[PDB]
């Protein structure tokens, strides 16, 4: 008979300490939950004490036992005699925090054992499930426990320590120049100055109307990151096959007309440039492309983890685009699906400590305004994305709407939400002949 690891002594000590000391409840409150107790009477006692504490009522022996008696739940717990025994047995000079931590650890271990048993039972009786589904199920089961225990890292911090850390960070940024770049280099001077690079562990959202160069801009960023670093760069393309992406990349890097490449009308110099580009790419060998359709966040996260494990770090992750992703459990409501996607992306960004650039799209309502430049509210149906995003960039091109625009070949990257810097608009040159973005050499305002 397997014996699950349960510490009845720790739970009894916690209960006795709470009865004999009501000031420590908060310390217990941040270490254990009601479901963490093995026996049903202990869970019921904790729930009643939580209700009393939230109502302002004392949690002494008489009031707790009486409250259980009034609701008729005293008999299930064990009685006033049992409550008095629990109160009296526990010595006053006890550290409730240690016992609470032991109880907290035991619940995690019990959940792990339950998940292992579920996986084994599912394997023995597949009920038509595939091996891939079982592997995904096991990964999800383990990651659920990991996140269940990955919530203690968030809480209040000391004011003086925060101030000292902020001062140290300011000094360090002014100490190590890097010419204004602290994160992953974007390959553009003005964007680097306004962003200090692409900060690791931050979610980046790129949004625009159709035909604005969103995929083009993302690919230019990816190529710049690959050429200016050594860590691998991963691309998730749910909308294009990898061959078209590579053709676009060849047009951008070799500065050859995309139509010529697509139709094959290339001369000797174009072939030489393409050979040079291929040689550089094969010498570097740090770009990975995944053109699978109907991607799920689990597959994206698993592939990112595998790349980081294989190569010891990821320079940048790119997803195009998140409106094509699916969560099967929440297909009924799109807003819940989007929230789950955003949460999973943020968790992946935190876990791998990498910059993640996810592309998004805007509704037609933006085009109902006289000024079509995007704003934050144009992220309707994706509020969780706007909240969880650490950087938000919108792409705008005036020449798209106006033929006679004076800004032909000029694109605007608008920072609608920046976590660690200022917002503003950056103008760049758009060479659609080469399918590329470049630094703007004209006057800046």
């Amino acid at each position: 008979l397997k014996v699950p690891p349960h510490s009845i002594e720790a739970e009894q000590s916690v209960l006795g300490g709470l009865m004999l000391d009501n000031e420590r409840w908060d310390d217990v409150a941040e270490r254990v939950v009601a479901d963490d107790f093995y026996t049903r009477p202990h869970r019921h006692i904790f729930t009643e004490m939580a209700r009393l504490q939230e109502s302002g009522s004392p949690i002494d022996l008489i009031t707790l036992a009486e409250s259980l008696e009034r609701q008729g739940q005293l008999d299930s717990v064990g009685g006033f005699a049992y409550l008095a025994e629990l109160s009296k047995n526990t010595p006053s000079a006890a550290n409730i925090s240690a016992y609470a931590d032991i109880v907290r650890e035991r619940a995690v271990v019990r959940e792990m054992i339950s998940v292992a048993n579920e996986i084994a039972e599912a394997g023995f009786d597949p009920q038509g499930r595939t091996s891939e589904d079982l592997l995904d199920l096991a990964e999800s089961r383990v990651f659920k426990i990991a996140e269940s225990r990955a919530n203690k890292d968030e809480g209040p911090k000391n004011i003086a320590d925060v101030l000292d850390a902020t001062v140290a960070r300011i000094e360090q940024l002014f100490q190590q120049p890097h010419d204004g770049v602290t994160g992953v280099n974007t390959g553009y001077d003005d964007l680097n100055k306004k962003t200090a690079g692409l900060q690791p562990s931050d979610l980046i959202i790129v949004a625009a109307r159709p035909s604005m160069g969103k995929t083009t801009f993302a690919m230019n960023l990816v190529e710049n990151a690959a050429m200016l670093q050594d860590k691998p760069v991963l691309i998730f393309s749910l909308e294009m096959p990898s061959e078209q992406i590579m053709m676009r990349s060849l047009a951008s890097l070799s500065r050859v007309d995309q139509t010529k490449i697509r139709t094959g009308q290339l001369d000797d110099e174009d072939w030489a440039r393409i050979s040079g580009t291929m040689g550089i790419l094969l010498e570097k060998r740090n770009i990975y492309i995944d053109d699978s359709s109907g991607l799920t966040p689990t597959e994206v996260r698993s592939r990112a983890r595998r790349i980081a494990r294989e190569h010891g770090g990821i320079g940048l992750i790119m997803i195009d685009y998140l409106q094509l992703m699916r969560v099967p459990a929440l297909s009924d409501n799109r807003t819940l699906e989007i929230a789950e996607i955003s949460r999973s992306l943020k968790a992946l960004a935190k876990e791998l400590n990498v910059p993640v650039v996810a592309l998004s799209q805007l509704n037609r309502s933006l085009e109902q305004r006289a000024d079509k430049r995007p704003v934050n509210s144009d992220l309707r149906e994706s509020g969780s994305i706007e909240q969880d995003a650490d950087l938000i960039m919108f792409i705008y091109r005036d020449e798209v709407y106006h033929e006679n625009s004076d800004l032909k070949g000029i694109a605007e990257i608008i920072i609608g939400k920046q976590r660690n810097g200022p917002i503003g608009t950056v103008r760049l040159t758009f060479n659609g002949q080469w399918s590329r973005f470049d630094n703007y050499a004209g006057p800046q305002y």
Partner: peptide, 22 residues
């Protein structure tokens, strides 16, 4: 200049920065 800025940085680190610091 830069040297004076770094010197003042170190001075402030000594004056207020403690325990963790950098």
């Amino acid at each position: 200049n830069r040297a004076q800025a770094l010197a003042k940085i170190a001075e402030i680190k000594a004056k207020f920065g403690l325990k963790g610091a950098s």
